């Protein structure tokens, strides 16, 4: 929650140290609303489960790596969160 | 496409010159804000108490209903949550 906001805020300031120009407004809202499809969530969760055993709580970086492999671009916080929620629904250990 | 055009309009209007880093947290927090399940039920109820099921419910009707409940200016998302709940009982919507 506060971790999610830290992440987006961190991204937004790093991306735009001096303000968000109007030319980037559609782009920004679209980015913030961007999400994985169900098929992508399934595929990320499966890939993570195939490669972990529970002794090591799946970290945000682990999810990032799996999602990046699928969408071939840098994942957003929402996309990471979607996969974390899917892993939680099967009781898989998560760092966060 | 309408939802996005609404929020995009709002952002352009709010910040004609650029979003200053000083407003980032305020903007993101507002964009992320949503009604609780109990708030959505209450807003839908209020509309259903004051409309007949034929006249289309407007964004304004819903905004007013939500404002009464949360006591601050509603966001597009908060309005959409109520519109979706009304649609689930076949209540007509202007948008």
Domain B1-35, CATH class in plain words: special
Closest residue on chain A to B11 (Cα): A25
Final resolution, Å: 2.0
Contact B48, B91 (CB under 8 A): yes
Q: Does B93 touch chain A (CB under 8 A)?
A: no
Contact B28, A12 (CB under 8 A): yes
Give the Cα separation of B50 and B80 in Å (integer).
18
CA torsion angle for B66, B67, B72, B75 (degrees, to 10)? 50
Exposure of B66 by Cβ count < 10 A (0-12 exposed, 13-18 middle, 19+ buried)?
Answer: buried
Give the Cα separation of A56 and A53 in Å (integer).
7
| A35-63 burial: b if 16+ Cβ within 10 Å, else e | ebeeebbebbbebbbeeeeeeeebebebb
Half-sphere exposure of B86 (CA within 13 A, CB side): 31
Closest residue on chain B to A11 (Cα): B24
Secondary structure of residue A4 in the 3-state scheme: helix
Could you tell me which of A90, A94, A96, A82 has the C-alpha nearest to residue A35?
A: A82
Q: Does A8 touch chain B (CB under 8 A)?
A: yes
Length of chain A: 96
Chain centroid to Cα A51, Å, comes to 18
Contact A19, B27 (CB under 8 A): no
Could you tell me which of B30, B50, B40 has the C-alpha nearest to residue B87?
A: B40
- For the domain bounded by B36-95, which CATH number is listed? 1.10.10.2390
User: Domain-by-domain residue ranges, chain A?
Assistant: 1-36, 37-96
Is the CATH number 6.10.140.2080 carried by domain A1-36? yes
At the topology level, CATH places domain A37-96 in Arc Repressor Mutant, subunit A (1.10.10)
Give the Cα separation of A54 and B62 in Å (integer).
46
Which residue has 């908060």 as its token pair? B78
Mutation choice for A interface testing from B24, B26, B75, B76 by most A CBs within 10 A = B24
Element (H, E) at B12: helix B2-14
Cα angle B66, B2, B48 (rounded to 5 degrees) comes to 35
Q: What share of chain A is helix, strand, coil (3-state, %, to 5)?
A: 65, 5, 30
Length of chain B: 95
Relative orientation angle of helices B59-70 and B37-50, to the nearest 10 degrees? 130
């Amino acid at each position: 929650t506060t971790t999610f906001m830290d992440n987006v805020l961190g991204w937004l300031h790093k991306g735009y140290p001096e303000g968000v120009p109007p030319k980037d407004y559609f782009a920004l809202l679209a980015l913030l609303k961007r999400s994985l499809t169900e098929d992508e969530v399934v595929r990320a969760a499966q890939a993570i489960l195939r490669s972990t055993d529970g002794q090591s709580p799946v970290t945000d970086d682990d999810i990032r790596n799996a999602v990046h492999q699928i969408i071939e671009k840098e994942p957003t916080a929402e996309e990471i969160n979607q996969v974390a929620a899917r892993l939680a629904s099967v009781g898989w250990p998560l760092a966060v």
